[PDB]
Amino acid sequence: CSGAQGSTLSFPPGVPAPTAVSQRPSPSGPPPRCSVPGCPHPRRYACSRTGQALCSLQCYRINLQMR
Amino acid sequence: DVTRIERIGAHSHIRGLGLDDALEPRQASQGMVGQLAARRAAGVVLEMIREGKIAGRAVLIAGQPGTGKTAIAMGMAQALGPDTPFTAIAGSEIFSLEMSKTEALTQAFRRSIGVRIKEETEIIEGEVVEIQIDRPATGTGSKVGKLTLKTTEMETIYDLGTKMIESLTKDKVQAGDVITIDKATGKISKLGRSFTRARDYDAMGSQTKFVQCPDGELQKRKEVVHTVSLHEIDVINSRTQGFLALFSGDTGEIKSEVREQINAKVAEWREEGKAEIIPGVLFIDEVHMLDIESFSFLNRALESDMAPVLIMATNRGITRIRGTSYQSPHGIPIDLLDRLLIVSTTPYSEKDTKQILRIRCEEEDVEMSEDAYTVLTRIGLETSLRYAIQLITAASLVCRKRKGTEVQVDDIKRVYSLFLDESRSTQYMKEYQDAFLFN
Amino acid sequence: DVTRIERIGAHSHIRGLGLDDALEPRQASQGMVGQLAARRAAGVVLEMIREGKIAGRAVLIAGQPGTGKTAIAMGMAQALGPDTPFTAIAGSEIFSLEMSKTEALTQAFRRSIGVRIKEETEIIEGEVVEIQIDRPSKVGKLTLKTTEMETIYDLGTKMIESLTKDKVQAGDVITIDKATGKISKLGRSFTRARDYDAMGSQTKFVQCPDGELQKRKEVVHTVSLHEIDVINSRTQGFLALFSGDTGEIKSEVREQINAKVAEWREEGKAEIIPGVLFIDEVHMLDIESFSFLNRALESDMAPVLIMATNRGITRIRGTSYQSPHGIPIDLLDRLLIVSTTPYSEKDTKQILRIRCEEEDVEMSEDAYTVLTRIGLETSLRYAIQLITAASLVCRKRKGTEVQVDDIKRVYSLFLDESRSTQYMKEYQDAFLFN
Amino acid sequence: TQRIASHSHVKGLGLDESGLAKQAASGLVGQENAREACGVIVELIKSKKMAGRAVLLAGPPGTGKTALALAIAQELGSKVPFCPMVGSEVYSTEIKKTEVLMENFRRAIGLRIKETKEVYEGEVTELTPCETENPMGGYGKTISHVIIGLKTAKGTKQLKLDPSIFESLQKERVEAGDVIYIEANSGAVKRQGRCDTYATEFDLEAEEYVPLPKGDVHKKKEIIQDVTLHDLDVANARPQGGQDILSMMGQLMKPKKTEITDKLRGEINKVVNKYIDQGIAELVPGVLFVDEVHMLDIECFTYLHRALESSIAPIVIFASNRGNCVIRGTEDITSPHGIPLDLLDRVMIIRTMLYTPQEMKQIIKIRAQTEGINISEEALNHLGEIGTKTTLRYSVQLLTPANLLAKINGKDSIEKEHVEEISELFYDAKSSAKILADQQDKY
Amino acid sequence: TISHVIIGLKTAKGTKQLKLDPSIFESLQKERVEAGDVIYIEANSGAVKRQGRCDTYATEFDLEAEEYVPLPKGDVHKKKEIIQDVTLHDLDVANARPQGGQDILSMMGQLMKPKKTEITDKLRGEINKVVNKYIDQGIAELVPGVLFVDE
Amino acid sequence: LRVLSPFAPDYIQRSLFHRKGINEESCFSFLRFIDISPAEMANLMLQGLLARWLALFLSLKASYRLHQLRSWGAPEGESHQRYLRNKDFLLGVNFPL
Amino acid sequence: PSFLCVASPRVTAVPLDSYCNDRSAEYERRVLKEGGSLAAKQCLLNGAP
Ligand SMILES: Nc1ncnc2c1ncn2[C@@H]1O[C@H](COP(=O)(O)OP(=O)(O)O)[C@@H](O)[C@H]1O
Ligand SMILES: Nc1ncnc2c1ncn2[C@@H]1O[C@H](COP(=O)(O)OP(=O)(O)O)[C@@H](O)[C@H]1O
Ligand SMILES: Nc1ncnc2c1ncn2[C@@H]1O[C@H](COP(=O)(O)OP(=O)(O)O)[C@@H](O)[C@H]1O
Ligand SMILES: [Zn+2]
């Protein structure tokens, strides 16, 4: 409807209340960082051979050299 | 301050032919002055155009450059008025790359026959009180609904149909909108919002100026007169949903079977009284631009019962017909020149020249002294009339730049020293004869 | 052995346009000879092109047939090098069957202005090793390989939908622009090129990539102003850059591109590299097309024009009138004229030696003597055509260094104009029409 | 920097406010009576009174008759449309000669039409339908409005919207933390993408992330838009919205110039009057400038007879360098300035003169200090003499190659020896033609 | 799901099984192929054609709208060296306009008529750059020919 | 004739990102400044008039999203008077009409 | 007005069709008579998939 009291929308009992409400996700304060302890960089990807988060080929060598 | 799209141009001062009801030319009236013989003749063919009984009659207006051939052509365009079609063509405009010459002339003819239709329809014009739209939970789609409309006097409820519901919801119609619905066409239109129900409201659904609530009875008649040329009837019929071709001009060389069929059905709408037919004018200005191929089309086009009254103008002497070797009068083949009446214009006196300059200065809002008119009248006989008509505004602007209220004789002598006559430029072209290219 | 798609043409002995730091010409260098004054003038305009400060400059290079007008223009194009546009057209390339002479010239101008742009990117490039997804939205992971690393991405939902629409497999090589989120297959890794017995028409094999997986860099693109004009002409305009099927671009677009490209230059986001338009045999441009150059030489982003021409006082095409070079006088004083001169015998030896150095041919100094006389008694470009034929006659003669008897043989086999027209008179009424 | 061209110094006509012309001002020198004439033409154009009244500049090559027509554009400034052409633009393959003129006659008139833009935009923090605890009779539950929470760098706001919005917010595939916008004049809603704050919740995801909008959740401005009547002619003749097969087919097909009817011109005139009367739209009658007018043919000229008379038309500037030439598209009809006598009758002519040696030297000085060049007096006093022997354009055009040569020879200003070295390397039209006449048999 | 499709083939000379790429199986389904059809596969190109239903099934119905062909007397599998001739003009044409992309089996290719076009200068620059890459890899070799202009 | 095509995604990538010169002109450079990726461009050249139609239908969706971004903010130059962005050659939205 | 559209072809022919004598060939003309994919058919008929 639209009327002198503004608009309204209405559903018969058993229609799905189809306007399901939506609300914000609540992520961590820091973004995920590189696993190498000397590296300030974000995670770009993770190693397939050992599972650690990484940011570069420099960190990929420096990780895999010591596992 | 305000300035509309049409402004002061080379014929804007002309507003008719200035004839009395006995069809005699007044010495100065409706912006026309002098030129009695051609104005008289133009009056007769104007009366023949208003009569409209006879098809394919034609006129050629002739005489010196700058002697009111086009003035008289615009004079009769304004005397004929907006309700009857007058098509101006400069003769070059038919040399299309999109379509051949005989097509471009057949379009110029058929653009100049009006078919006039009264569209009378019933409208509902009201302010939306409330709407209900009902939609199935899934189903086949059998939508249903109700709508309510008001005026300052009356209000009512409508039970809505299936195609109405999509046309309403397509234009986001809502309470407080003022709308005008055509019952025969099934089409909505939106006039604005009323000041009332728009207070029971949200973050904005629209932003426009409000409109006052509609008055009187909620259901009322409308009437429109369309003036549809034969050319646009042919174009609409050339391809389905072709309506944009009326603007873009992209439909070339239309099938003859369309014209043959529309010539019949336009006669049927006259015999039914369903539509008026109003034959108008085609003004082929500078017709000595047409090729002998195009004149030979006019010989046999200008004998159809659907032909408009055709007016040529031209300024040429014995000169060769464009696209051939042969010399002839007006640059036209006698094959055509035998068919149409010639209206002869005349050169101007001091009296006519001064009187033309005076009516021009009136339309351009200019004050000049009688001494400045005396020197400008001399200039308009020592040189062609259009150059004198070109000093007027320049002299008014130089007068304005020195903050004078009236153009003096030395304002015109100043401007005459500043902007050259052709006869003076073509004289200076003799000192620099080594420096200009390709003499 | 392996013949490239480019091979010895008429100009390919030049390697540039040899000059010292003072723009002083060397007598013989970079594959050019003589022509000292004309090469200084070509050098001065070449430095004027490199500086780029002033638009719409024009040079007319003029002088007798065979005196090296196109040899300056092609040598100058190589001395300017790549990385700055050099549109070269014969004058008659502008008479299109779909667009005006105005348009073909306008596009030839606009194609000669290069805009350089910096662009910042990270792009993934690697062999996909495997893909895993599961249903609880969706969740998944995929592994990428490059010769230096094997690595995993815990990709999102729209990416899982996009990969499952591209149907990618283990052993494909793929690229994704990380900022844009768009997938693009390259082919299948060479190690995979056998696990099918019959293979799809669109399949192609590529090496496994190398270096870092998600390379991060800014890069420089050079793109010419005409391409920006075409891209904005219609919704999918870039197809017309290749198809050729475009013309009569609306002037409202071209003047918008001037404003935007000037604006990017003031905003520091792009820089304008002025190129060259070379019109070889300009003399056969029509009078209407010459008059168009009178405004296009004035736009504050016109190229320089270099016009070669070969004509005395001659009828201007499309008119009765006669003028220098076959060019209208109102363009000739917007032009600046550079004149060649005929070669001496001493120069003509050196150019024939330079052609033989390029063709890898050896000749007696007697054969160079006789050929220089032939190339002086008749046009230079005929002697330049005897040397290859003398080499092939020498091969058929089972020789190795060519001799005067080979030159005299080929001279008896292939005629020049002056001898051929002389023999034509002796049978004239057997030829058709005059 | 921006790069120099053949008119970059021309900043205006440099008049006294009495309308008289200074000897040298606004980057021009000389032509005083022709600059005074252009002064009256600037007043004429600024007045908005007139239609179709027109001028020809006529004079020898290189006398300044394009520089004056550009100086008029500088005295008018960017706000009024000045539309340039050569006569040779008219010979299109797509469309007839006279229509290329008629379109340029419509480019030289501008609307200046001012309107409000208002929009709601931000990252969607929540979508919260709000129920009424009493339903209407027979129905399970009912919504009065939807709340959309929107965020921008300036703050967060709960907008209230009518429940029809929720249908469109599942046509758009919206989720919390998208950034979206809603057109306040229209009620339409659109999705831009996931907000950049979330550009790390996967190592790859198939969307380009959108930075958070800045300013308030509700934005308002006025904009003074400008369109030529020719832009209205094309936008009406070929619509661009895609929701029908005629438009998609017409937009996949090659774009084509089309012979727009006098009816479309008519309807656009009828409606811009409807808005100009209401004060919604300003109008700026502009200038059409045609150079090389002698390249138009007698069919073009015989169309200009109608176009220059018509009560709508712009003020028109023509330029020509010609003597008594034959008119293009006629066999042997000689006429002054290459223009038919019955068009030449319809225009005022401004005579443009040759320069004296002192005026040429003064032009060369004004060029050098705007081409970025320092010249010695012994160079300038030679270069004005070269211009006297040759032509203005040649003697001006020698400046930058003389600078290049001077810089190569390690010096900060052009010397006498550098001017004559460049003059030895580069021939002018007169010195070149003599070599063609001497060597007549070899070309 | 579909890494490959195994297909079995028979002729009067013997049998093979082949491991098809899913793009080739998509082509088998394009041709509406089923077991007991006689098929030609061109494995170097991905061309597929139904020759007809095999005549061992010619009695599956007494009268049905299929043409039956005898079980091929030829080998299951055939090899040749073949040498392909292609001109630079064939590349300049086939890469300039968007292809028809539509192997008859379509209908958009009915609407836009094919026509000759002024193929750009730049594209020929890229065809020369791609051909240079391939003659360096030895996948192609070059024969500069002759153009002969009568009249 | 389709394998030797410069429209192959391999050659587009190798033209676009693997160049030798610090400055070096190459084709498909404009694809960095229109919303078109190498495989989408190859597919648009080889799938014919259907892929033309879908790439058109998406371009209209992209036009409304571009117009908002193009007309409601002015954050100077992207790294202090440097670097262009995706879609920056699409100027068909800057016309008032 | 709702009545200016009144011209008509005098004749309206069926689009021409190529009969061919082969089991594989006749599927191709059938596919063309249907419209050659549901994607391309929906694309013209309803505007996009
Ligand atoms: N009799 C007239 N009365 C008023 N104005 C006239 C008259 N004759 C000519 N004019 C005006 O003088 C000018 C010349 O007339 P025009 O129609 O252009 O001449 P033509 O077509 O014969 O060459 C125009 O400005 C026109 O409006
Ligand atoms: N100065 C030169 N040094 C070396 N080769 C030259 C020189 N001048 C001309 N050539 C060569 O001589 C031939 C004729 O020169 P070209 O420029 O083509 O003549 P034209 O001026 O008539 O067009 C070509 O093979 C060209 O490469
Ligand atoms: N009065 C002037 N004052 C200063 N520079 C001028 C003047 N007149 C012409 N010029 C310059 O001389 C050159 C030729 O003038 P231009 O108007 O372009 O030639 P044309 O008259 O043939 O059209 C241009 O560089 C122009 O800027
Ligand atoms: Zn580091």
Swiss-Prot record, chain A:
Region annotated Disordered, chain positions: 11-35
Compartments where located: Nucleus; Nucleus, Nucleolus
ZnF HIT-type span: 30-61
Protein role: Induces growth and cell cycle arrests at the G1 phase of the cell cycle. Proposed core component of the chromatin remodeling INO80 complex which is involved in transcriptional regulation, DNA replication and probably DNA repair.
Oligomeric form and interacting partners: Component of the chromatin remodeling INO80 complex; specifically part of a complex module associated with the helicase ATP-binding and the helicase C-terminal domain of INO80. Interacts with RP9.
The protein's name in its UniProt record: INO80 complex subunit B
Native organism: Homo sapiens (Human)
Organism lineage: Eukaryota, Metazoa, Chordata, Craniata, Vertebrata
Curated annotation (Swiss-Prot), chain C:
Gene Ontology biological process terms, A to Z: box C/D snoRNP assembly; cellular response to estradiol stimulus; cellular response to UV; chromatin remodeling; DNA recombination; DNA repair; establishment of protein localization to chromatin; negative regulation of canonical Wnt signaling pathway
Disulfide bonds: none
Organism from which the protein derives: Homo sapiens (Human)
Subunit structure of this chain's protein: Forms homohexameric rings. Can form a dodecamer with RUVBL1 made of two stacked hexameric rings; however, even though RUVBL1 and RUVBL2 are present in equimolar ratio, the oligomeric status of each hexamer is not known. Oligomerization may regulate binding to nucleic acids and conversely, binding to nucleic acids may affect the dodecameric assembly. Interaction of the complex with DHX34 results in conformational changes of the N-terminus of the RUVBL2 subunits, resulting in loss of nucleotide binding ability and ATP hydrolysis of the complex. (Microbial infection) Interacts with Mumps L polymerase; this interaction regulates the viral transcription.
Top EC category: hydrolase
Keywords on record: Acetylation, Activator, ATP-binding, Chromatin regulator, Cytoplasm, DNA damage, DNA recombination, DNA repair, Growth regulation, Helicase, Hydrolase, Isopeptide bond, Membrane, Nucleotide-binding, Nucleus, Phosphoprotein, Transcription, Transcription regulation, Ubl conjugation
Protein's name according to its UniProt entry: RuvB-like 2
Short name of any one Pfam family annotated for the protein: TIP49_C
Protein origin, superkingdom: Eukaryota
Transcription regulation keyword on record: yes
From Swiss-Prot, chain E:
GO CC terms: centrosome; ciliary basal body; cytosol; dynein axonemal particle; extracellular exosome; Ino80 complex; membrane; MLL1 complex
UniProt keywords, alphabetically: Acetylation, Activator, ATP-binding, Cell cycle, Cell division, Chromatin regulator, Cytoplasm, Cytoskeleton, DNA damage, DNA recombination, DNA repair, Growth regulation, Helicase, Hydrolase, Isopeptide bond, Membrane, Mitosis, Nucleotide-binding, Nucleus, Transcription, Transcription regulation, Ubl conjugation
UniProt cross-link Glycyl lysine isopeptide (Lys-Gly) (interchain with G-Cter in SUMO2), position: 73
Localization annotation: Nucleus matrix; Nucleus, Nucleoplasm; Cytoplasm; Membrane
GO biological process: box C/D snoRNP assembly; cell division; chromatin remodeling; DNA recombination; DNA repair; positive regulation of canonical Wnt signaling pathway; positive regulation of DNA repair; positive regulation of DNA-templated transcription
The keyword Phosphoprotein is annotated on this UniProt entry: no
Keyword Cell cycle: yes
Top-level taxonomic group: Eukaryota
Domain notes per entry: Binding to MYC is dependent on a Myc domain essential for oncogenic activity.
Additional remarks: High level of autoantibodies against RUVBL1 are detected in sera of patients with autoimmune diseases such as polymyositis/dermatomyosistis and autoimmune hepatitis.
Protein name stated in the entry: RuvB-like 1
Gene (UniProt): RUVBL1
From Swiss-Prot, chain G:
Tissue specificity field: According to PubMed:10574462, widely expressed. According to PubMed:16298340, specifically expressed in brain, liver and pancreas.
Superkingdom in the source lineage: Eukaryota
Compartments where found: Cytoplasm; Nucleus; Cytoplasm, Cytoskeleton, Spindle; Chromosome
UniProt comment concerning the protein's domains: The DBINO region is involved in binding to DNA.
Additional observations: Although the ATP-dependent helicase activity displayed by the INO80 complex requires INO80 ATPase activity, it is likely that the helicase function is carried out by the other components of the complex, RUVBL1 and RUVBL2, and not by INO80 itself.
Function text: ATPase component of the chromatin remodeling INO80 complex which is involved in transcriptional regulation, DNA replication and DNA repair. Binds DNA. As part of the INO80 complex, remodels chromatin by shifting nucleosomes. Regulates transcription upon recruitment by YY1 to YY1-activated genes, where it acts as an essential coactivator. Involved in UV-damage excision DNA repair. The contribution to DNA double-strand break repair appears to be largely indirect through transcriptional regulation. Involved in DNA replication.
Family assignment from sequence similarity: Belongs to the SNF2/RAD54 helicase family.
Record-given protein name: Chromatin-remodeling ATPase INO80
The species this protein was found in: Homo sapiens
